[PDB]
Design a protein around this nucleic acid. Structure first.
Ligand SMILES: O=P(O)(O)O[C@H]1[C@H](OP(=O)(O)O)[C@H](OP(=O)(O)O)[C@H](OP(=O)(O)O)[C@@H](OP(=O)(O)O)[C@H]1OP(=O)(O)O
Lengths: 56, 176, 37, 213, 162
RNA sequence: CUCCGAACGGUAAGAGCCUAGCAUGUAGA
RNA sequence: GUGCUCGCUUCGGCAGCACAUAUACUAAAAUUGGAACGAUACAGAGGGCCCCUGCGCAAGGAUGAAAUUCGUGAAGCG
């Protein structure tokens, strides 16, 4: 089935593999990705640019 | 890891930070296809990208409780716990619809009743269509008024239970 | 189902005037809401 | 019903030996003397909601400590599952002894408190309130899950059954002859108060034995 | 399982005050190094001290010749490793025992940066001593036994340099 | 002719891979 | 902080008197490491101690550790 080369493990059920790399201690060892909330202006740029990219 | 918000969160007084939804429904929200993707991390910006690309407004569908991406995204933003300014920014966006819908729903779940009326009242003017998923899977196109009316007046307009907003008469007698 | 104790160990110049070092011993209130720890 | 009431009355008349003992043992009088208790004045509905929340949080933390993330008490004191675990989890949730009875008692208490919270929060607010308390003691007869932990309860529920026909055939006489009479809890609440006052020590012992583990 | 009357304490652990105030607790806190219920009593060694307590139980400390809350000694003041491997101890010890043990440990809110308590921090506002030396790393059970001390080698090499 | 009950006696045991809500707050230099 | 001195002496102050006399598992904090009989892939049953459910030292299930013969030494007796 699914294969994780980082841990070199064989993930059987699609959901079993989906719940490894999202939470993998070894993969997390490649960098702490704790997402901090950006500034109030940061959430405005993503709203503005998408209004000009998707629509326009 | 979907336990804490980031490291510390101002706990909503109702039940808990993550537990404003029923334990069964949140436990179902986690194990899901839509959660498997985008659970890598969504703090402030990618939430906007994931919100403008889901034109559904609903809760659970199917015999097996299947969460809509609307509902799972509400829960994801609930775990993220954004600041009030970002939520007012989502509540002020008129171009993208379901983004504003999620902003209103979150401001209802986490927010002061005074703030609830102050930010959700002017969302009671849009006479546009909104798609929703019924419990049997079949979709239905309704009015935005129906949504905000069930949200502000009715209980559990979606699968989530609402945190008991006062009657408006008490606040009209005491405040604005 | 007070105490007076001469510290016979070290008294030379610890505790300037390490004469006999009296103390007070109270007991701490046990709340009756604590299971077996 | 009258026969059952007279039976309880007479059987109480025999087992009435003069009580004089115990050297006046009092509770909640030494607790106030320690630094683990403070007196205040707070409205009754507030105290009821406080007790309900406290009991729920006490049971929820019991379930939390016990490493059971697949069960939920549901805030009406009705223990609900999550994912239908059946490998070895269902063997780790066979309480049946005290958790069941504490759940039933706190469910009854929180239900009465909610019936009274709806009053102050805009319920019917008329005699409907007393009708609610009446049918609430009826449901404590039937709707509550009291039967399982203790079966002798049925005896007093039989009283709560027989006592019912002591009031309705005195209330539903004359013009009012059909509709649901609201009645009073002057006898029902009395019975349940004597009951809880009698079974305080059993649950004290059971809670002690269970908290030891 | 272990009650007593008075603690087998130090002379520095008690404090630089001839009158302190103890507080006995029958059967508290579960002894650090043998896991047995014993009689915890704390006190205040002096003004702006650390509110020191009692760790190591009566039989635990009486058997191995050591104080109930620092594990150094009642007779000398050295650790239990130097006083076992190593006399030399009498010139190695000290009188006037420094009260740099009875002081509050470092305010972690200050180390992070926002100590909200201001001047009212009942903890201590110094810089957290750098982690690198093994005198950042000692524990209780390795200390209390002779095996593996970070202090006792560093003081045992003070014994043959000069 | 209205009196209505619940638990246990129950779900074989298994080797390879994987993910997690919880817990200490200290001694000492 | 409060009340008072036929006080220095004004109604600005100074001095004195008296009541009140020791809270704080100190820190909002600081790192440290862990577990499902849980889904998924695979085959498809010949005496007590350590645990779990549990209120009962009610009750219910499980892996892990005896007699003969001879020689020697000693006590004691004639
Ligand atoms: O159906 P009945 O045999 O005639 O007795 C009923 C019945 O009481 P019981 O079934 O316990 O004997 C109702 O209670 P329910 O079980 O139907 O809930 C009760 O009403 P309450 O719940 O308020 O006590 C009241 O019926 P009603 O609604 O008319 O008041 C009562 O006697 P009656 O029917 O003769 O009045």
């Amino acid at each position: 089935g699914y294969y994780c080369n980082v841990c070199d493990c064989v993930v059987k059920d699609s959901i079993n593999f989906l719940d490894h790399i999202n939470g993998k201690k070894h993969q997390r060892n490649l960098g702490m990705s704790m997402r901090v909330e950006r500034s109030t202006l940061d959430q405005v740029k993503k709203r503005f640019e998408v209004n000009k990219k998707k629509m326009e | 890891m979907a336990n804490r918000t980031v490291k510390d969160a101002h706990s909503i007084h109702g039940t808990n930070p993550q537990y404003l939804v029923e334990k069964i429904i949140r436990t179902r929200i986690y194990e899901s296809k839509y959660w498997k993707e985008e659970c890598f991390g969504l703090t402030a910006e990618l939430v906007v990208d994931k919100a403008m690309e889901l034109r559904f407004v609903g809760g659970v569908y199917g015999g097996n409780i299947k969460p809509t991406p609307f509902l799972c995204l509400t829960l994801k933003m609930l775990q993220i716990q954004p600041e009030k300014d970002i939520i007012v920014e989502f509540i002020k966006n008129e171009d993208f619809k379901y983004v504003r819908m999620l902003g209103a729903l979150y401001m209802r779940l986490t927010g002061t009743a005074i703030d609830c009326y102050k930010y959700l009242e002017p969302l009671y003017n849009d006479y546009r269509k909104i798609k929703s998923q019924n419990r049997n899977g079949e979709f239905e196109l309704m009015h935005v008024d129906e949504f905000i009316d069930e949200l502000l007046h009715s209980e559990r307009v979606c699968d989530i239970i609402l945190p008991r907003l006062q009657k408006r008469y008490v606040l009209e007698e005491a405040e604005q | 189902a007070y105490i007076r104790y001469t510290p016979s160990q070290q008294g030379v110049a610890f505790n300037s005037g390490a004469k006999q070092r009296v103390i007070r011993m109270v007991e701490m209130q046990k709340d009756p809401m604590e299971p077996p720890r | 019903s009258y026969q059952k009431l007279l039976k309880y009355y007479v059987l109480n008349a025999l087992k009435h030996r003069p009580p004089k003992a115990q050297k006046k043992r009092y509770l909640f009088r030494s607790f106030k003397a320690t630094k683990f208790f403070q007196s205040t004045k707070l409205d009754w509905v507030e105290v009821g909601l406080q007790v309900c929340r406290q009991g729920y949080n006490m049971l929820n933390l019991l379930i939390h400590r016990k490493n059971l993330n697949y069960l939920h008490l549901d805030y009406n004191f009705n223990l609900k599952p999550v994912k239908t675990l059946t490998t070895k989890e269902r063997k780790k949730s066979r309480f049946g002894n005290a958790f069941h009875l504490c759940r039933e008692v706190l469910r009854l208490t929180k239900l009465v408190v909610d019936s009274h919270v709806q009053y102050r929060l805009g319920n019917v607010d008329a005699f409907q309130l007393a009708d609610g308390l009446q049918y609430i003691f009826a449901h404590v007869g039937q709707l509550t899950g009291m039967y399982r932990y203790k079966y002798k309860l049925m005896r007093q529920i039989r009283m709560c059954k027989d006592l019912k026909h002591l009031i309705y055939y005195r209330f539903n006489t004359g013009p009012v002859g059909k509709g649901p009479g609201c009645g009073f809890w002057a006898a029902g609440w009395r019975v349940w108060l004597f009951f809880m006052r009698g079974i305080t020590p059993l649950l004290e012992r059971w809670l002690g034995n269970l908290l030891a583990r | 399982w272990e009650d007593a009357d008075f603690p087998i304490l130090c002379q520095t652990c008690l404090g630089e005050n001839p009158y302190i105030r103890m507080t006995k607790e029958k059967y508290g806190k579960e002894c650090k190094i043998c896991a047995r219920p014993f009689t915890v009593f704390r006190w205040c060694p002096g003004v702006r001290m650390r509110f020191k307590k009692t760790e190591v139980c009566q039989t635990c400390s009486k058997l191995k010749n050591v104080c109930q809350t620092c594990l150094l000694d009642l007779e000398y003041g050295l650790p239990i490793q130097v006083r076992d491997a190593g006399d030399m101890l009498l010139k190695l010890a000290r009188t006037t025992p420094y009260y740099k043990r009875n002081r509050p440990h470092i305010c972690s809110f200050w180390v992070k940066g926002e100590c909200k308590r201001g001047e009212e921090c009942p903890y201590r506002h110094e810089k957290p001593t750098d982690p690198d030396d093994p005198l950042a790393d000692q524990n209780i059970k390795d200390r209390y036994y002779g095996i593996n001390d970070p202090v006792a080698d560093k003081l045992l090499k003070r014994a043959s340099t000069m």
